[PDB]
Ligand binder design. Structure first.
Ligand SMILES: *[C@@H]1O[C@H](CO)[C@@H](O[C@@H]2O[C@H](CO)[C@@H](O)[C@H](O)[C@H]2NC(C)=O)[C@H](O)[C@H]1NC(C)=O
Ligand SMILES: *[C@@H]1O[C@H](CO)[C@@H](O[C@@H]2O[C@H](CO)[C@@H](O)[C@H](O)[C@H]2NC(C)=O)[C@H](O)[C@H]1NC(C)=O
Ligand SMILES: *[C@@H]1O[C@H](CO)[C@@H](O[C@@H]2O[C@H](CO)[C@@H](O)[C@H](O)[C@H]2NC(C)=O)[C@H](O)[C@H]1NC(C)=O
Ligand SMILES: *[C@@H]1O[C@H](CO)[C@@H](O[C@@H]2O[C@H](CO)[C@@H](O)[C@H](O)[C@H]2NC(C)=O)[C@H](O)[C@H]1NC(C)=O
Ligand SMILES: *[C@@H]1O[C@H](CO)[C@@H](O[C@@H]2O[C@H](CO)[C@@H](O)[C@H](O)[C@H]2NC(C)=O)[C@H](O)[C@H]1NC(C)=O
Ligand SMILES: *[C@@H]1O[C@H](CO)[C@@H](O[C@@H]2O[C@H](CO)[C@@H](O)[C@H](O)[C@H]2NC(C)=O)[C@H](O)[C@H]1NC(C)=O
Ligand SMILES: *[C@@H]1O[C@H](CO)[C@@H](O[C@@H]2O[C@H](CO)[C@@H](O)[C@H](O)[C@H]2NC(C)=O)[C@H](O)[C@H]1NC(C)=O
Ligand SMILES: *[C@@H]1O[C@H](CO)[C@@H](O)[C@H](O)[C@H]1NC(C)=O
Ligand SMILES: *[C@@H]1O[C@H](CO)[C@@H](O)[C@H](O)[C@H]1NC(C)=O
Lengths: 130, 48, 429, 192, 96
């Protein structure tokens, strides 16, 4: 900042920087809320349990199990669409029931029943002899 | 001095390094009306 | 003229490109974030407008679902994921450049790689972390600004790898079985016989294809090479896909920029209003701001709906073209490219598809003298989509000069030699 | 009035003379070469043989065409004459084009008329507001007017976009019809 | 029936018309003119709404370009400007 400037503003006219009146240090100001959240449900008629998908959160190294999630739980893991909490991962491929995104689909299966997530299948395999 | 509309450019630092005077000529008017210092080849509507 | 005809004596194989948008970006809006930021007073005042925001988000979610519907309808037209053949010769027709190469790390083909290189996107990860945005502030990232103001872009259901797998399956299926697949169970057939059938489908005998196989294959390979070179050279061939991307980005950035309007309030900064004014007047100012920003969101949604309708029309046309040009041989003039359609190949591209149409083009016309009918022993003989030509008189097909001796096999007898205008006298073997 | 209120209509790129030249070229090309042009290089052919080919294209032998040529030509000429007479007689055959014109004109005129609304201000006349009031209150009234008039323009633009989409669909269909009915013989039932 | 057929013995040549819109009027708007007229006070107050007017004019210019695109796509479908023949007989088919 120049000596005659006290505040800074961005293209939206939001105040994004300020000079501290005591030390003269320049500080950036950023919003607190950020990130996309989605809720996966099998239907309230069937159950009250849900899975939560956090886009913009990386959970690959689950060692703290300062993550920006509402609550942890069982089967927290990362997928191509973000950090998924509340679903069990299965290696089998089925037809997409609830498309989550980026090739991932969720369903409600008998383990008792629980929410499962998997990679969707693209079609049956075939071999044609040219 | 005269009352006029200018378009000022702030660079990576906080310093004003360039400006466009919107009343200088039709090209300046077009630059101010599209709010950009660069114009691609073509024909553009300006003010009446 | 009235007594002469022009017949081609040669032909060339032509391959041309057609670029079609399929889908656009899926977006979502957090009303409270965009309008009020982190202000609890504004959030409380906004509660009485919940219906409008629910309506906006209903519209946007409908658009988002329709995008995945478009992609599925265009690309998922096969039940079997036909494996890519190991040998890509097919009787002299070099398919390598349009099929994926096992050696290279990429799962796409060479031309698909070129196509994906020709279009530039702002971001491809669909993942931007809070630490990343907070720590690169000096960059002034447009995506960071969008996200901090409550605007989100969602990832498509199908990945580029899956779409490329579908296109590879389609190309392999057509190369190994032709057109039988898509009308039932795939029935494999040699590529030369396939090409002979396609030639027969445009009124040219298949002896021509079999007798000019080397020339036809060389011309096909040369056309493929020309396409590859043209795509390698920088140009504006993918302008439609590029401007789809640009329109989406511009809409979001304009939405961000419009937050600086006062809309008649003393200021456009909620914090300034709340720092200077007590609740009673602050409420009036905040109401003005809420009205304006809600209007901005509604305008965004309306324009998005119109754009989505246009994109859906394009996607429907693309699906029809897939069905009628890739899975079969079309007779609609100028539908699958210019000329007499032979066959088409699809290739994936960012937000769309690219069709490579292969058609037959007659060339090198020569003159001949023609007669509507020929009189023999007082009886009139007519052609049956052929033409009589005087080199002696012969009968030939109209798309390729192959003169043949007249005989009762290739002539239709009707009436006498009186009514026919312009009949010439000849003999019939 | 439209122009004095800042609304302009621009001329199209191609003039009526050039469009008519294109249509004349298309008609001459079909009459002299038939359908070969459009799939490659034009190949001229006599019109009787062309009509014989077209007859063959619908499952009728061409001996029929050649043996009834005079009657077929007379019927074609009579059909042309009937079209000419019907067009000469006043009717509403071009209602679609007429209503396109009418819709555009009405939209612009409505835009002009909507300037008389107060939008909650003390008056709809800027000169009256500025002659009676000092800057502070004049600003409030003028802000109301600006909001209203901006909304009017936005409504006009939205409706223009929707109309344009409809017109584009119609134009795409017309181009397809040109290609498939004028440059070739179609087999799609009831298309041409 | 189950044992009889009906076959035409004659035919007629029919000509019918089909009318299709192709293009509509291209228009442009001067925001300042429409909203403020010749008033400098109003013009100054309008400056804080430049984004909305740029948006409107972008939409209108897109429409204007699309109209010429439509006309070209419909009518420019030939590479050679074939000349009008002098004789318009064509074996009894009157083209004049
Ligand atoms: C305002 O007063 C504070 C408190 O004395 C000053 O801050 C201190 O300044 C001294 C001298 O430079 C530093 O050693 C300290 O570290 C600072 N902080 C504290 C907590 O003591 C400050 O400089 C004064 N500001 C102005 C503009 O004079
Ligand atoms: C989430 O963070 C982890 C940890 O940094 C990333 O995992 C590494 O990613 C790098 C970069 O691609 C790879 O070279 C390493 O092999 C990865 N390590 C492990 C143990 O997997 C991960 O990529 C991040 N996720 C995303 C989506 O960015
Ligand atoms: C913004 O100001 C900085 C600081 O003066 C400039 O960075 C210096 O630029 C000079 C002139 O090119 C270089 O000799 C120095 O090495 C730079 N310093 C550093 C730390 O990089 C910077 O160029 C200015 N930005 C612009 C756009 O002019
Ligand atoms: C049709 O045109 C092709 C292509 O011009 C001719 O192919 C030529 O064949 C001769 C040998 O007979 C080669 O030396 C030339 O290089 C070929 N021309 C090329 C590659 O352009 C072909 O002979 C012509 N005639 C027929 C009946 O196909
Ligand atoms: C099909 O075409 C490709 C590409 O032109 C050919 O692969 C090239 O082969 C040459 C000669 O061996 C090499 O120098 C190039 O590096 C190859 N390019 C690539 C991209 O692999 C291929 O040989 C052709 N196939 C046949 C059967 O002729
Ligand atoms: C089909 O109908 C036409 C029209 O009625 C017939 O053509 C007429 O033929 C008679 C002589 O047979 C002429 O006098 C008339 O001038 C012709 N036209 C009309 C409009 O009357 C024709 O004969 C009928 N049959 C066939 C096989 O063409
Ligand atoms: C084609 O039709 C036109 C229009 O009916 C004919 O031109 C008319 O001919 C008559 C008789 O000579 C004249 O009285 C009219 O003035 C002409 N009208 C026009 C507009 O030129 C023309 O003769 C017909 N052609 C043939 C070959 O019969
Ligand atoms: C609704 O409720 C039952 C009991 O939870 C649930 O299992 C069932 O699937 C639902 N009924 C349907 C889907 O018809
Ligand atoms: C056929 O003859 C015509 C006679 O006018 C001539 O103009 C034309 O060039 C000839 N065609 C060829 C291919 O030589």
């Amino acid at each position: 900042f120049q000596p005659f400037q006290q505040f800074g503003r961005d293209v939206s006219d939001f105040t994004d920087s300020v000079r501290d009146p005591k030390t003269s240090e320049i500080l950036d100001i950023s919003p607190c809320s950020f990130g996309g959240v989605s809720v996966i449900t099998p239907g309230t008629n069937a159950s009250s349990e849900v899975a939560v998908l956090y886009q913009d959160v990386n959970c690959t190294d689950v060692s703290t199990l300062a993550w920006r999630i509402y609550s942890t739980g069982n089967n927290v893991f990362q997928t191509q669409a973000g950090c998924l909490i509340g679903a069990e991962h299965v290696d089998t491929s089925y037809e997409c029931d609830i498309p989550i995104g980026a090739g991932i689909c969720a369903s409600y299966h008998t383990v008792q029943k629980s929410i499962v997530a998997y990679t969707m299948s693209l079609g049956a395999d075939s071999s044609i002899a040219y | 001095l005269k009352p006029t509309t200018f378009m000022l450019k702030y660079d990576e630092n906080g310093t004003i390094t360039d400006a466009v005077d919107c009343s200088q000529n039709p090209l300046a008017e077009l630059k101010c009306s599209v709010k950009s210092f660069e114009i691609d080849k073509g024909i553009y509507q300006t003010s009446n | 003229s009235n007594n002469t005809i022009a017949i081609p004596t040669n032909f060339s194989i032509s391959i041309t490109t057609e670029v079609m948008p399929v889908s656009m970006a899926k977006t979502s809006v957090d009303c409270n974030m965009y309008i009020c930021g982190d202000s609890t007073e504004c959030a409380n005042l906004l509660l009485q407008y919940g219906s409008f925001c629910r309506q906006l988000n209903r519209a946007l979610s409908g658009i988002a679902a329709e995008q995945d519907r478009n992609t599925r309808e265009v690309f998922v037209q096969v039940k079997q994921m036909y494996k890519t053949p190991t040998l890509k010769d097919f009787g002299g027709f070099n398919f390598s450049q349009i099929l994926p190469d096992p050696l290279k790390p990429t799962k796409r083909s060479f031309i698909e790689d070129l196509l994906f290189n020709k279009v530039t996107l702002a971001d491809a990860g669909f993942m931007k972390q809070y630490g990343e945005c907070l720590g690169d502030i000096n960059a002034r990232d447009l995506i960071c600004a969008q996200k901090f103001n409550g605007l989100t872009v969602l990832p498509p259901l199908l990945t580029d790898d899956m779409i490329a797998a579908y296109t590879a399956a389609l190309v392999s299926g057509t190369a190994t079985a032709g057109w039988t697949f898509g009308a039932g169970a795939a029935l494999q057939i040699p590529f030369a016989m396939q090409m002979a059938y396609r030639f027969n489908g445009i009124g040219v005998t298949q002896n021509v294809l079999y007798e000019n196989q080397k020339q036809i294959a060389n011309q096909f390979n040369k056309a493929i090479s020309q396409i590859q070179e043209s795509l390698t050279t920088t140009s504006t061939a993918l302008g439609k896909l590029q401007d789809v991307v640009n329109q989406n980005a511009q809409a979001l950035n304009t939405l961000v920029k419009q937050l600086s309007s006062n809309f008649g309030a003393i200021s456009s900064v909620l914090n300034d209003i709340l720092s200077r004014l007590d609740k009673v007047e602050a409420e009036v100012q905040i109401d003005r701001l809420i009205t304006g920003r809600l209007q901005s969101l509604q305008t965004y949604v309306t324009q998005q709906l119109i754009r989505a309708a246009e994109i859906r029309a394009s996607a429907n046309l693309a699906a029809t073209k897939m069905s009628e040009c890739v899975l079969g041989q079309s007779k609609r003039v100028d539908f699958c490219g210019k000329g007499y359609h032979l066959m088409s190949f699809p290739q994936a591209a960012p937000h769309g598809v690219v069709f490579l149409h292969v058609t037959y083009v007659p060339s090198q016309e020569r003159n001949f003298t023609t007669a509507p009918a020929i009189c023999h022993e007082g009886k009139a003989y007519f052609p049956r989509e052929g033409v009589f030509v005087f080199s002696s008189w012969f009968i030939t097909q109209r798309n390729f000069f192959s003169p043949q001796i007249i005989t009762t096999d290739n002539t239709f007898v009707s009436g006498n030699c009186d009514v026919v205008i312009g009949i010439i006298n000849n003999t019939v073997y």
